[PDB]
């Protein structure tokens, strides 16, 4: 390996094998000092170390690993593929980052809200290596990006147009109102025409470099897709609004420029570990042994608990304490050891070797050592990744600062508590070795096929397996079921629906079983041509699957999603990133790539990910690294937009914090408007909309215990067709992550109902969490609260009257046709929300969190308020109703005779239709509910909470029985007319 010294000096080194040859830095340094007195002089002025670089594909690569040359096998492999035996490695100086580079890093830190460069809370370099490794997918996505299409970011869908929208096209024609200057012309175009065809038709109906941009929005109708396939066109058709566009010059792609990457490419960390035959010590001469295979170590796993150190004792419970160490792989405890109970004081000493029954060779990748401090009940927890991200077993002393509790995603984090000065600390010792112990490469090759089976299953065992496969995800598998699934694993591949159960039947605590599983999934084909099922992929991405290959399988199926489909499940994927044992996972790469590919997905990813950085200390660093990668990826125009969004968010944070400490709000608003308020900023919950000035005279503060800010902004686009403002509620002191998760689930449910051609008029609003207990909510205009409608006439003293809501809706209807449309919309929306809240289990609400528009549509708001109460109590100690079906709703629907009515019958029919539609996607709904409980809850969840949905979704029952069940739920709702609302009013008062 020839080396090029920093003076063009070429020192011809020789290949020194692979044993302890990362003194190659020191070797080449000493050789340079000997071979050049200039190097001797520079030794007194040179940096601490240097960098070794090469050129894998013309682009410059770095050898970023200081342990062994076995890592550097990729450069040698490329050189031998190109057949250039003398390889060139350039030794370059550790030049400090430039001034512009540091300024850009400071801007990125300001945007993220976390300092990724801070290495004060890391016991390894997994986060820094992830930062270096995410450069390759980022550069791949930036290079393979359409400039014009990225700049204009069209929002399209390939799903078929629903029939309830098809009936809204009068004569297979759509009218588009095109605006040029102040002139407006209506052009009739068929729904199968691309925007280019419409534009050519407009020009023929008398340059050609123009695009159609939605008036008042930053949304473009461009690309080669039918005009009916645009999400904006479908939205306008659904709302019956007129489609207005303006003839705008295309945005310059040059504005989306990405600055050059400072770092050379890091390649991969899979080089340090090879096949077992390469790492094993058997057959060696005890002098060529430079690394030891993990599968050679036949001893039991052993960890020395040295002690426990706390600055000040908590006063909740004391008088006894012990440590429980669990070797576990994805919430499955492989082994568990306990220490002797000792008196609980500030410093407790054991110095005891806990030796598990699991062999060292049987530790899987992603195995987790969970150290938990129990009392006498559980007090503290911390986790350590037994196998490092370089496939290396952990060695040495570890002083891990523990997490204090106050099934949960936060219980799986490998991060250490940043509060060094006040947190519990546990000291452990893992055995040191002369040679590093490396877990061999996952699977060399399934050439023997693992004895793929030939014999047919008996009919009875086939029936048993098929019955097991058809069962719901939450149904536990007994020992016999797991044995049947694994014993016939090669038959379980043929059914993709059995993959979660099949991989739950794998004994991850045995090395040979894991090798057999890898051989099994190396020959997956029925899964590859399988149609994409979102529920199955979500199941494979749950907390029960810590294996890298299963996650890779799930992400490989995720890659076939559309942009809008990814937008549907983006929050769920971001939350599922928590379950990945390692920072640089396939899910993180997938999210980064698909946020760099689409501008809307990128915007929502930035906000969803910044919220988790701000509020969750457990996954601050991983999410911060991912967000830094994305922000380096996106163009400079979208970086400026993000900067303006963060500026307005922070200044409104300050204003909310100052007001909540207490006409004053008005004055603070004129102080903002005259200084530090951006001229226009993109709305966080709606990237297509740009809010300009602030209508200070219309802002106020609600009479709430949280005192949120009611702000109304001016639309910054001069092309807007209405003087309507933009309403935004900035709330402090409430966790909006649960609220936004519930809203995402509602949007998914609405998409399902649309798929089955049902329009329930259920529309979720725009809620984005922006920081620790602070967030932003869209204001739905012409809407009020049912509680406020009641309090208009009766309800201040608790009395409730049935005619209030019907009369209120009648008063807001200018004509009788408007009243009938409002009544129909109310029926549909009430059915949709009743079904949704019954399925999700958040149906037991009160009037203060249910709203209605003047058009009849119904809303549920403030989901964080009731979700926590439901989790804590479950309504079992009070009078619980499945959902809020109040007698005023019934009066709006029927004649209040408590027998029937045509509108009530229609409500029952449509709600039954929606219930069966959801039962069709039961599995996806169940997995979404499970992820929401795992990730969105700051508390700790368990069973009897997750499984509630499989009782609400009527799992394992006939369609007629499910219909009867929902009718019984409706009847019990009708039984408790005002009792539950009166009880809620008493509890609040």
């Amino acid at each position: 390996i020839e080396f090029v010294l920093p003076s063009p000096e070429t020192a011809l080194l020789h290949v020194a094998g692979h044993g302890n040859v990362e003194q190659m830095k020191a070797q080449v340094w000493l050789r340079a000092l000997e071979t050049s007195v200039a190097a001797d002089f520079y030794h007194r002025l040179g940096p601490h170390h240097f960098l070794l670089l090469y050129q894998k594909k013309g682009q410059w690569y770095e050898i970023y690993d200081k342990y062994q040359v076995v890592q550097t096998l990729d450069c040698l492999r490329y050189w031998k593929a190109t057949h250039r035996s003398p390889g060139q490695i350039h030794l370059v100086q550790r030049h400090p980052p430039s001034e512009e580079s540091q300024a850009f890093q400071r801007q990125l830190t300001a945007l993220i809200g976390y300092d990724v460069t801070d290495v004060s809370n890391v016991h390894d370099d997994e986060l820094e290596f992830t930062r270096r490794g995410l450069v390759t997918p980022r550069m791949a996505e930036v290079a393979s990006r359409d400039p014009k299409l990225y700049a204009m970011h069209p929002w399209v869908t390939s799903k078929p147009l629903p029939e309830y929208l098809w009936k809204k096209i009068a004569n297979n024609c759509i009218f588009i109102v095109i605006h040029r200057s102040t002139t407006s012309q209506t052009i009739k175009v068929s729904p199968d025409d691309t925007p280019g065809a419409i534009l050519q038709s407009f020009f023929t109906k008398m340059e050609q470099d123009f695009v159609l941009r939605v008036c008042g929005r930053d949304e473009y109708l461009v690309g080669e897709t039918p005009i009916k396939n645009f999400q904006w066109v479908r939205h306008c058709l659904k709302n019956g609004e007129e489609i207005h566009v303006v003839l705008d010059t295309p945005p310059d792609p040059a504005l989306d420029e990405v600055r050059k990457e400072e770092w050379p490419l890091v390649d991969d960390c899979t080089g340090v570990t090879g096949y077992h035959e390469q790492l094993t010590i058997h057959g060696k001469d005890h002098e060529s042994v430079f690394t030891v295979s993990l599968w050679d170590c036949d001893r039991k796993f052993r960890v020395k608990i040295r002690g426990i150190d706390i600055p000040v004792l908590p006063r909740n419970t004391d008088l006894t304490v012990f440590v429980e160490a669990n070797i576990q792989h994805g919430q499955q405890v492989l082994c568990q050891r306990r220490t002797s109970p000792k008196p609980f004081t500030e410093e407790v000493l054991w110095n005891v070797w806990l030796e598990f029954s699991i062999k060292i060779k049987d530790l899987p990748k992603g195995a987790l050592l969970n150290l938990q401090i129990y009392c006498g009940q559980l007090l503290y927890y911390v986790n350590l990744l037994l196998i490092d991200h370089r496939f290396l077993l952990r060695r040495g002393e570890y002083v891990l600062h523990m997490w204090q509790i106050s099934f949960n995603a936060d219980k799986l984090t490998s991060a250490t508590n940043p509060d060094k000065e006040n947190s519990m600390s546990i000291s452990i010792l893992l055995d040191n070795y002369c040679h590093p112990i490396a877990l061999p490469k996952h699977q060399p090759t399934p050439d023997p096929e693992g004895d793929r089976v030939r014999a047919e299953m008996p009919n009875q065992l086939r029936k048993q397996l098929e019955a097991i496969i058809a069962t719901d995800p939450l149904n536990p598998l007994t020992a016999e079921d797991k044995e049947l699934l694994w014993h016939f694993r090669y038959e379980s591949l043929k059914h993709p629906k059995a993959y979660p159960k099949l991989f739950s039947s794998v004994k991850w605590g045995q090395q040979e079983i894991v090798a057999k599983t890898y051989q099994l999934l190396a020959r997956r084909e029925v899964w590859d041509q399988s149609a994409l099922d979102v529920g199955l992929t979500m199941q494979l991405l749950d907390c029960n699957f810590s294996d890298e290959n299963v996650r890779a399988i799930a992400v490989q199926k995720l890659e076939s999603l559309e942009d809008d489909d990814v937008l549907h499940y983006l929050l769920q994927l971001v939350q599922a990133v928590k379950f990945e044992p390692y920072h640089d996972s396939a899910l993180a790469r997938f999210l980064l790539k698909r946020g760099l590919r689409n501008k809307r997905i990128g915007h929502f990813l930035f906000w969803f990910l910044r919220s988790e950085i701000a509020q969750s200390r457990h996954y601050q660093q991983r999410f911060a690294v991912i967000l830094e990668a994305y922000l380096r990826g996106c163009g400079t125009a979208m970086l400026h937009d993000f900067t303006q969004q963060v500026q307005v968010i922070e200044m409104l944070q300050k204003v909310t914090l100052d007001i909540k400490s207490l006409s004053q709000l008005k004055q603070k608003l004129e102080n903002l408007q005259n200084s530090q308020l951006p001229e226009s900023f993109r709305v966080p919950y709606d990237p297509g909309l740009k809010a300009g000035a602030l209508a200070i005279e219309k802002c106020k503060v609600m009479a709430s215990k949280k005192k949120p800010l009611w702000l109304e902004f001016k639309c910054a686009d001069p092309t807007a067709l209405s003087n309507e403002t933009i309403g935004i509620i900035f709330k402090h002191g409430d966790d909006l992550r649960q609220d936004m998760l519930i809203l995402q689930i509602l949007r998914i449910m609405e998409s399902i109902w649309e798929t089955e051609s049902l329009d329930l008029c259920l529309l979720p609003y725009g809620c984005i969490s922006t920081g620790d207990k602070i967030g932003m909510i869209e204001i739905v205009k012409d809407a009020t609260t049912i509680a406020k409608i009641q309090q208009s006439t009766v309800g201040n003293t608790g009395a409730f009257k049935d005619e209030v809501l019907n009369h209120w809706l009648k008063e807001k209807s200018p004509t009788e046709e408007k009243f009938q449309a409002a009544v129909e919309r109310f029926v549909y929306s009430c059915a949709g929300y009743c079904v949704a809240t019954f399925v999700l289990g958040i149906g037991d609400r009160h009037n203060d969190n249910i709203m209605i528009t003047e058009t009849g549509n119904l809303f549920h708001i403030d989901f964080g308020h009731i979700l926590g109460n439901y989790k804590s109590f479950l309504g079992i100690n009070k009078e619980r109703v499945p959902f809020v079906l109040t007698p005023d709703f019934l009066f709006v629907m029927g004649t209040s005779g408590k027998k029937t009515s045509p509108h009530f019958q229609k409500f029952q029919d449509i709600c039954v239709k929606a219930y069966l539609a959801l039962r069709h996607h039961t599995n996806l709904l169940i997995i979404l509910f499970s992820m929401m409980l795992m990730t969105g809850m700051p508390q700790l969840t368990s069973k009897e909470d997750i499984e509630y949905i499989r009782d609400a979704l009527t799992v394992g029952k006939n369609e007629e029985d499910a219909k009867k069940y929902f009718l019984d739920q409706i009847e019990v709702c009708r039984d408790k007319g005002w009792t539950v609302q009166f009880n809620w009013f008493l509890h609040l008062v």
Binding site: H286, C297, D298, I360, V399, S425, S427, Y433
Partner: protein, 547 residues
Amino acid sequence: DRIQHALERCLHGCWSLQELVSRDPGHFLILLEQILQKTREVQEKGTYDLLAPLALLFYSTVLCTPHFPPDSDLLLKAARTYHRFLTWPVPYCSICQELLTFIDAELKAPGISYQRLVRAEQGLSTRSHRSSTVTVLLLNPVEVQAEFLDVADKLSTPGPSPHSAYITLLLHAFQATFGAHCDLSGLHRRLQSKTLAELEAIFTETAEAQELASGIGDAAEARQWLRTKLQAVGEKAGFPGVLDTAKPGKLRTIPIPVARCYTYSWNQDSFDILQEILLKEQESTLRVVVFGSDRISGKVARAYSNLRRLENNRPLLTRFFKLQFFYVPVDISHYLGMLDPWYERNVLGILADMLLYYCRFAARPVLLQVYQTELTFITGEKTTEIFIHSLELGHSAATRAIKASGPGSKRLGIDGDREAVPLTLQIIYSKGAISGRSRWSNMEKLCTSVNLSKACRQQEELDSSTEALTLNLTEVVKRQTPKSKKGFNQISTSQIKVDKVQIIGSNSCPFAVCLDQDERKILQSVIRCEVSPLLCLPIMTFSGALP
């Protein structure tokens, strides 16, 4: 069979009897079979405790055994068995690698290790660059013990001459390759008439041949080349037939000679005689064997601290040299035996054999945990660098004693068990250094007596390998003024786990220190006492501090 029983009895602890059962040359191979079987069982069951004693027994037996048979596979089986140990933690795989290198050297050159050890100990002429020698000093005050004084006298005898040492080395080297096919009686009879220069030349040639064969790279080729070179040397020097000369001539043990041990009493003068014995050697490594009870632990630690301050500009270490310290109890030994079960069974528990075994086969230094004490006087002068095992603090009769001592006399009355008038004591203790977070806490009250003890004195009933210190408040104030309830009156034994301590007195109430009843040290009149915890005294044991 009886050798296996003796081995088993030795492990589950017998020791000298076990070493002496190997009186016949085949007993060595039988014991090696047994040790290899025990090692295989240990590895299969993952027993960490038995690895170090078994490794040491194997090393000693292979060192002493004469002429591994040509058809024997003990060396290869042992090499495979130990090479299987490379997956073990560091303190065990280190011994593994040492034995692997030793086994490879003994397989390539049958008598390399015994020749190396005996040549180094006897200080015989060496043609290798930077020739080495081994010197043993037995530091015995005339008041240590009669039996130990006699065994030191037995070791101190010069004994074998260079002529006899050369004869023994040549006999062992030639038998290790020509076991039953050499006339050892005839070879010795011919060697007895050889001159000293001839013996030196023959030994240098044979040693060079053995060192060259130790790195040939092929075991069979190395053995063949060594055999050919030894035959050539024998033919050159007039040796009799050594190639299949006589089947009747059987094997001889050729035991290790007594090393040239020097017995000199240093009279506790901070290791002065080591320089004298360097100077005499001038006219490499030296082994210091310290005999004595706990009363000289302070003297030993002062001596080693002085040596560690001085060697930077002293000829003891600048010249190629290695200083090793061995301790025989005749409570450092309690701590060492607690860490090392082999040391507990062999040293802490016919005696010259055990002393020589401890000197020769203890190669893992254990650093004794010693406490650095610094005292600030009442007169403004600051003293530092005091070393102890326990401490008695606060006694006013003891500060009367220290005032009587002054700046140039012994502190008569510092022994403790003395009534103390109440004094204004401030106690500062640091806690939590296990996690790197040192938390200082302060009390300021009236006190008379405080105990500052090391857990290692009573570590047999506590957390394993605890280097922390215990601060005990007991028997306070009641010795003089039991009714002084304002201070630390009475106070039952209260223990605080501490690492750094600062005890502050007052000018009107002078403070005192009792350094394990050491009245030799001079300290004028101290007030402030600071005790702080790799440190000092690397006493060699058979197996280091296993984690």
